[PDB]
Amino acid sequence: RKLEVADEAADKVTDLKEVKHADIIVAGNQAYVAVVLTNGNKGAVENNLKKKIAKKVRSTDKNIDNVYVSANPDFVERMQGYGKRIQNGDPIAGLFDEFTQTVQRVFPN
Numbered sequence: 001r002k003l004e005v006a007d008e009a010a011d012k013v014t015d016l017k018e019v020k021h022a023d024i025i026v027a028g029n030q031a032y033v034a035v036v037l038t039n040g041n042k043g044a045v046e047n048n049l050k051k052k053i054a055k056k057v058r059s060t061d062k063n064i065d066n067v068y069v070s071a072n073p074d075f076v077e078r079m080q081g082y083g084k085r086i087q088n089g090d091p092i093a094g095l096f097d098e099f100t101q102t103v104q105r106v107f108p109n
Contacts, residue, residue, distance in 0.1 A: 003027055003092050003099060005083050009064075012056040018049050023079040024057065025086070025099070026064065031057045032103050033069045034079035045069050068107045075106045 006024040009031065013022035021036040033053060035045065045053070054067035082102075085095055 001092060001096060003082075003086060003096065005086050006031060006057070006060065009033075009057045009060040012060055013053055016049075016052060016056065019053065021076075022053075023076070023083050025079065025082060026061070027099075029063055029065045031061075031064050031067045032079070032107070033057060033067060034076045035069060035071050036076060037071055042071050042073050045071050068103065070106050072106055075102065078102045 004026045006026045009026070010022040010024045010033075013019050013024070013033065013035065018038050019035050020038050023034045025032050035053065037045070037049075050069045053069050057067045058064050079102075082095055082099055086092070
């Protein structure tokens with residue numbers, strides 16, 4: 001139920017030359033990462049770059065085990081919106097159900 005914007009993690013991800021923008025929300029030991037790639041690819045993130053992104057995220061917080069990464073354009077939009085609402089002080093109760101639906105769609109079983 002605890003959703004946090006991970007600004008330090010997003011900053012470490014954009015130290016990668018391949019990643020232009022990142023929006024990251026952490027729900028417990030799980031990080032959800034929306035990326036805009038330098039090369040404009042909006043398909044599945046290439047597996048080696050996903051691993052490098054995950055290494056950047058885990059470096060900021062010893063509690064993070066699982067890192068989910070997508071460049072899907074709708075996901076990028078949704079995560080930018082969720083990030084703004086959280087940091088502006090909106091109740092997590094107001095958006096937790098929406099967030100859950102988004103990440104269950106983007107990151108299925």
